[PDB]
Ligand binder design. Sequence first.
Ligand code: CHL
Ligand code: CHL
Ligand code: CHL
Ligand SMILES: CCCCCCCCCCCCCCCCCC(=O)OC[C@H](CO[C@@H]1O[C@H](CO[C@H]2O[C@H](CO)[C@H](O)[C@H](O)[C@H]2O)[C@H](O)[C@H](O)[C@H]1O)OC(=O)CCCCCCCCCCCCCCCCC
Ligand code: CLA
Ligand SMILES: CC(=C/C=C/C(C)=C/C=C/C=C(C)/C=C/C=C(\C)C=C=C1C(C)(C)C[C@H](O)C[C@@]1(C)O)/C=C/[C@@]12O[C@]1(C)C[C@@H](O)CC2(C)C
Ligand SMILES: CC1=C[C@H](O)CC(C)(C)[C@H]1/C=C/C(C)=C/C=C/C(C)=C/C=C/C=C(C)/C=C/C=C(C)/C=C/C1=C(C)C[C@H](O)CC1(C)C
Lengths: 219, 221, 61, 37, 56, 51, 35, 252
Amino acid sequence: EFYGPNRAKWLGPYSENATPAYLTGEFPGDYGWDTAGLSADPETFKRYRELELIHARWAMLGALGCITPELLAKSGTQFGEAVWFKAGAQIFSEGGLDYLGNPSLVHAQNIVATLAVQVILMGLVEGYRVNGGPAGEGLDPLYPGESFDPLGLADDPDTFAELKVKEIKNGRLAMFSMFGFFVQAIVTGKGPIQNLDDHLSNPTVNNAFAFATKFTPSA
Amino acid sequence: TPDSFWYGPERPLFLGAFTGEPPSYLTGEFPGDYGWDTAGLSADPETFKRYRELELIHARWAMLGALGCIFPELLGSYGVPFGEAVWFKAGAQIFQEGGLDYLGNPNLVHAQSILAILGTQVLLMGAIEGYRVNGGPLGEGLDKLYPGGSFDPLGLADDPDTFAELKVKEIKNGRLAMFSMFGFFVQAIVTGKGPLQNLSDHLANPGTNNAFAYATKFTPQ
Amino acid sequence: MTSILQVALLALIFVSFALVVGVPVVFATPNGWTDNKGAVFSGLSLWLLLVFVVGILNSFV
Amino acid sequence: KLPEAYAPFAPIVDVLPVIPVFFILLAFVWQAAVSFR
Amino acid sequence: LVDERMNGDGTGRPFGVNDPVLGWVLLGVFGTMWAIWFIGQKDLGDFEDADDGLKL
Amino acid sequence: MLGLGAWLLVWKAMYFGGVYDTWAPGGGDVRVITNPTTNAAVIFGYLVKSP
Amino acid sequence: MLTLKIFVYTVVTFFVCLFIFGFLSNDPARNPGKN
Amino acid sequence: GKATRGWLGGQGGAADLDKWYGPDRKLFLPSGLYDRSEIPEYLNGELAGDYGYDPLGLGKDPETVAKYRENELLHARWAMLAAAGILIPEGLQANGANIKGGTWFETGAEMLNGGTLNYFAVPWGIVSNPLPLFAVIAVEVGLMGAVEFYRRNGTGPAGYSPGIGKFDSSVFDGLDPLYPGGPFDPLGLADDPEVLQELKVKEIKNGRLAMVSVLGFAVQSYVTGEGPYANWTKHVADPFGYNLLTVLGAEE
Ligand code: CHL
Ligand code: CHL
Ligand code: CHL
Ligand SMILES: CCCCCCCCCCCCCCCCCC(=O)OC[C@H](CO[C@@H]1O[C@H](CO[C@H]2O[C@H](CO)[C@H](O)[C@H](O)[C@H]2O)[C@H](O)[C@H](O)[C@H]1O)OC(=O)CCCCCCCCCCCCCCCCC
Ligand code: CLA
Ligand SMILES: CC(=C/C=C/C(C)=C/C=C/C=C(C)/C=C/C=C(\C)C=C=C1C(C)(C)C[C@H](O)C[C@@]1(C)O)/C=C/[C@@]12O[C@]1(C)C[C@@H](O)CC2(C)C
Ligand SMILES: CC1=C[C@H](O)CC(C)(C)[C@H]1/C=C/C(C)=C/C=C/C(C)=C/C=C/C=C(C)/C=C/C=C(C)/C=C/C1=C(C)C[C@H](O)CC1(C)C
C-alpha cells in the first residue's frame, strides 16, 4: 500500500470516487484529497510539494522546539522563561538570554545583533537550497542526498520510497500540531504541557467549551 | 526586443546569483519580471495575465496612497490647521462640528453629509471604473493597462524603447509603494501613531524606538 | 642597570649611522644589491636586535 | 625632561628637528651632482 | 518689546531657516532646477559606458 | 584605514581612561565619556549651522 | 521682514542651482580643443 | 563528480592551486629580498606549507624531508586541540562554569589525592567525574598504547565501535601515510582531490600557528602566572598598562 490504486485514503473505504485523476499515487502522501481543486495543474501540483515538505520539516523542528524548554522545566531546571511564546522576550531581561540556567553559556544581550546575524546565515542557506552551495549543486530540490544523509539511509530505493511516507506523515502531524500550539495559546494563554495538565486534571470541565464564550462581541 | 537589460534572459533576478533559473513561463518580456513565482499561482497563461491588471491597478492606487497619506500629515506639522493630520484619523473629520474643511480652510469644500460624499462617490467611481473596462469618451478600443492618447497628454510614451523602459520604472515605483503602504497599516495598528510620528521618534533614539519595543504588546492575557 | 643601557644605546647610533650611509650606497651601486644581499640583512637585523634589547631593560631601570 | 638613563643624550636630541630641512637641501645637492641633466 | 523683529541671529537654526516656509523655499526651488536639468540630460551625451570622461 | 583611526579616539575615550574634559566641575580633568551624544539631529546641527 | 527673507532664499538658491547644475552639464567637453 | 557551488558567488572548486604549488608560490620573504635562484632544490612547490623557509639547512633531500613531515604534521594536529583545550575551560572558569581547575598548568595539581575532577559538557551541563588518578592513567596508557601501535603497524582493528558504522570489518593497507582517508572521513570531503590539495594547505597553516600558540601559551604563563585567557582579557582591559615590558619591572 501507500502507492498505486490500492493505498490508504482520506475517507478510507468510502473514497474510490472522490479521488481525482491527477492524484495517482506516485508521490508520497498521495491520499487523493483535493476537494477544493487547487492542484489541477501538473506544474502547480509540483510546486506545492516544495511548500508542503518545507513546512513539514520546519514544523517538526517547531513541535519539539516548543516542547523541550517546558519538559525540562518539569525536571526543575530554571530558565527565566519556560513557556514557548513568552520565550522571545527574555533577551529584554536583566540577565539576558542564557542557553540554559547557565550564565556561562551564550549570554545574549542585544536583540538587533542576534537578528542581523540570522539574516546573513539563514539568508544564505536558503539560497543554497534553491540553486546550490558547497554541499552540492545539481540535486533533487527536496531529497538532495549525500552530505545531508551521511548514514546511507537513502539506499535500497524500496526502503527509500517508504521512508518518504514516514517523513510527511510525521510532518503532516506536526503542521497540524503546531496549528494547535498557536490557537491553544491565543485562547487560553498558557503553555501546551501546562494546559495538557489542566485537561488531565479534570477532563470534563477543562475543555475548549470552558473558553467558548470568550470571544463574544461585548458591545 | 532590444538589449534593454530588463527584458530577456539576462534580466536580474530576485535572489541575485542564487536564483539559478526562472520558471519556464516567466521568460522576461513583461515589466518587473525578476522571476519570483515560487508558489506558482500564475502558471496558466490566461491566469498570469489576470494578475497583471490586478497588480498594476494595485500599484496605481498605492502610489497615490503613499503620497496621499503623508502629505497632509507633513503639512500639518508645519502649522496648516487641519482637523486631523493622521491618515487613519482623518476619515472621522465629517463628524466634527465645522464639517470637513479642506486644508483646514472653512471657505473651501465644507462637506457636511457623509451620505452625500458616498452618494456621489459611487455614481462617479462606477462610471470611470466602468469606462476603464470598456468604452468611455476618452478612448474606445485601446489597451486595458496602457491606454495612452488622452491619458498620455505630454507625449512621454511615444518611442518604443523609452516607453518599454518607463514601464519598468512604473512597476518598481509601484511595488515600492505597495510594500510601503502595507507598512502604514501594520505600524498604525501596532504603534497607534501617525507614520511620520513613528519616523521622528526613530530618528530620536534609534536603539530604543525600533519595533522590538512593541514586541510584547500582543501577549496573550 | 643604567650603564648596561647606555653602552647598548651608544651601540645603536653607530649601527644607525652605518645604515643611514651604507644602505643607499648598497642600492645605487650597479649589482650592489645582488652582492651584499645577506650583508645588509646582518646590519638590519642587528638594528632590530638592539631596539628590543634597549626596549626591554627600561622596565629594569 | 628626559629620563635619567637617557639624560646623557640631550645634545644629540637637540639636532633631530632640523633633519627634514636637510632633505630638501640634499635634493639640490644631488641635482648638482648629475649637473642638472 | 518696543519693536518686533526676528530674534534669530545667535540661535543656530539650520541653514538659517526658522519659518518652515523657508524649507519649502529651499527645497522647492531646488527640485525645480533639478527637474529642468534632468529632462535636458538627453542632450548632454550618453556616457553609459565603461570609461567615457575627459580622460588622459 | 581612515575610518578605523576615528574609532581609536572613541575607544580611548570610552574604555581606555578617557580624555581631558575641561568642563568638569572644579577644574577640568580626565573623564571617561560613558554616554556619547549620537543623536543625528544634534550631530548634523553643527554642519548646517552658520559660521 | 519675513517677506524679504523668503525672497532672498528664492534668489540665492536659484543662482546657486544654476551653478551646480551648470557644471554638471558636460562642461569639460565645452572646449575648442579637438581629439 | 561532486558538482558543487561556490560559497558567495556562483562557482566552486579550487580557487587557485598556482598560489601554493609549483615554482610560483608564496615564500617566507617577498621577491625583492629572495629570488628564485636562492631556493634549496630539495624544496620545490609540491607539498603544502612550502614557503621555502629553511635558513638552517636541516633538510637534505625530499626523502629526509618527508619523514620530518611526519614530525611536522603530527606536532601540528596535537597542538591544534591543545589551544582549544587550554583556552576554552579557562573562559568557562571565568564566566561561572565551575570547572575547579580550568587553568591549564595547574590542572593536574587539582586532581591529586581526593580526585573528584569536574567536567562541564556543552550544552548538556556539569558532570562530576568520580574517577581517581590511577584509573585515568591505566585508561590513558591503555588506549594510547593501542592507538600509537595502530599507526606503527599500518593496520588496526576491524570493528567500528569508534564512532562509525559504515561497515568495513577489515583492515586497511592502501591508504596514504599522513593522510588516512578511509575510515577517518565520515562527511565526505574526498571527491575532488584539487579541493583536498587546497584543504591540506589550510591544514598545515592552521596547524603551524597553533604550534606557535602553545609556545606562546607556556612562556607567557611562566612569566606572569596566568592562563592565557586571563592574559588576553587583561591586555584588552588596558593595553599600555599591561603588556610584556611592564610586567618585568612591576616590583619597582
Ligand atoms: C470512513 C470514515 C472516515 C471519515 C468520515 C473521514 C473524514 C475525514 N478524513 Mg479521513 N475519514 C475517514 C476514514 C479515514 N481517513 C483516513 C486518513 C485521513 C488523513 C491523513 C486525513 C484524513 C482527513 C479527513 C477529513 C477530510 C475532510 C475535512 O478536512 O473536514 C474538515 C471539516 C470538518 C470536520 C467540519 C467542521 C469542524 C467541526 C466538526 C464543526 C464544529 C464547529 C465548532 C464546534 C465551532 C465552530 C468554530 C466557530 C465558532 C468559529 C475528514 C475529517 C484529513 C484531515 O485530517 O483533515 C484535518 C487528513 O489529512 N483522513 C484513514 C486512514 C486510511 C481512514 C480509514 O478508514
Ligand atoms: C480606500 C480604502 C479605505 C480604507 C483602507 C479606509 C480605512 C479607514 N477608514 Mg475610511 N477607508 C477607506 C475608504 C473610505 N473611508 C471613507 C469614510 C470613512 C469615515 C467617516 C471614517 C472612516 C474611517 C476609517 C478608518 C477606520 C479605523 C481603522 O480601521 O483602524 C486601524 C486599522 C487599519 C487602518 C487597518 C485597515 C486596513 C484594512 C482593514 C485593509 C484594507 C483593505 C480593505 C478591506 C479594502 C477596502 C476597500 C473595499 C471597501 C473595496 C480606517 C483608516 C473612520 C475613521 O476616520 O477612523 C478614526 C471613520 O470615521 N472612513 C469613505 C467615504 C465613504 C471612503 C471611500 O472609499
Ligand atoms: C553583549 C554581551 C555579550 C557578552 C559579554 C557575551 C559573552 C559570551 N558569549 Mg555570547 N555574549 C554576549 C552576547 C551574545 N552572544 C551571542 C552568541 C554567542 C555564541 C555562539 C557563543 C557565545 C559565547 C559567549 C561566552 C564566552 C564563553 C567563554 O568562556 O569563552 C570561550 C570562547 C573563547 C575563549 C573565544 C571567544 C572570546 C569571546 C568571549 C567571544 C565570545 C562572545 C560572543 C561571540 C560575542 C562577543 C560579545 C562581546 C561583547 C564580548 C560569553 C558568556 C560562547 C559560548 O556560548 O560558550 C559557552 C559561544 O559559543 N555567545 C549573541 C548572538 C550573536 C549575542 C548578542 O547579544
Ligand atoms: C531645513 C532643511 C532644508 C533642506 C534643503 C534641501 C537641500 C537638499 C540638498 C540636496 C543636494 C544634492 C545636490 C546634488 C544632486 C546630484 C543629482 C545628480 O547628479 O543627478 C544625476 C542622476 C542621473 O539620473 C539618470 O538619468 C538618466 C537620463 O537618461 C536620459 O538621458 C540619457 C543621456 O543623457 C539617455 O539619452 C536616455 O535615453 C535618457 O532617458 C536616466 O534617467 C537614468 O535612469 C537616471 O539614473 O540623477 C539622479 O539620479 C538624482 C538622484 C537624486 C535625486 C534627488 C532628488 C531630491 C528631490 C527632493 C524633493 C523635491 C521636490 C521637487 C518638487 C518640484 C515641484 C515643486
Ligand atoms: C604605502 C605602503 C606600501 C605599499 C602599497 C607597498 C606595496 C608593495 N611593496 Mg612595499 N614596503 C612598504 C610599504 C608599502 N609597500 C614599507 C613601509 C616597507 C618597509 C618595510 C616596504 C618594503 C618592501 C620590500 C622590501 C618589498 C616590498 C614589496 C612590495 C610589493 C608587494 C609584495 C609584498 O608583500 O610586500 C612586502 C611587504 C610586506 C609583506 C610587509 C608586511 C605586511 C605589513 C606588516 C602589514 C601591516 C599593515 C598595517 C595596517 C600597517 C599599519 C599602518 C600604520 C599604523 C603604520 C608591493 C609593490 C616587495 C616588492 O615590490 O617586490 C619586489 C618587496 O620586495 N615592499
Ligand atoms: C587526546 C584524546 C585522545 C583520545 C583517543 C581516543 C578516544 C581513543 C579511542 C580508543 C578506543 C579504543 C582503544 C577501543 C578499543 C576497543 C576494542 C579494540 C574492542 C574490540 C574488538 C575485539 C577485542 C572484540 C576484537 C575484534 O577483533 C576487534 C574489535 C574492535 O571488535 C582525547 C581527548 C579528549 O577526551 C579528552 C581528554 C577531553 C575532552 O574534553 C576533549 C577530548 C579531545 C575529546
Ligand atoms: C491539503 C489541502 C487540500 C485541499 O484540497 C485544500 C486544503 C483543505 C486547503 C488543503 C489543506 C491545507 C492545510 C490544512 C494546511 C495547514 C497547514 C499548516 C497548519 C501548516 C503549519 C505549519 C507550522 C509551522 C511550519 C510551524 C513552525 C514553527 C516553528 C518553526 C517554531 C519556532 C519556535 C520555537 C521552536 C520555540 C520558540 O520559543 C519560538 C518559536 C519561534 C515559536
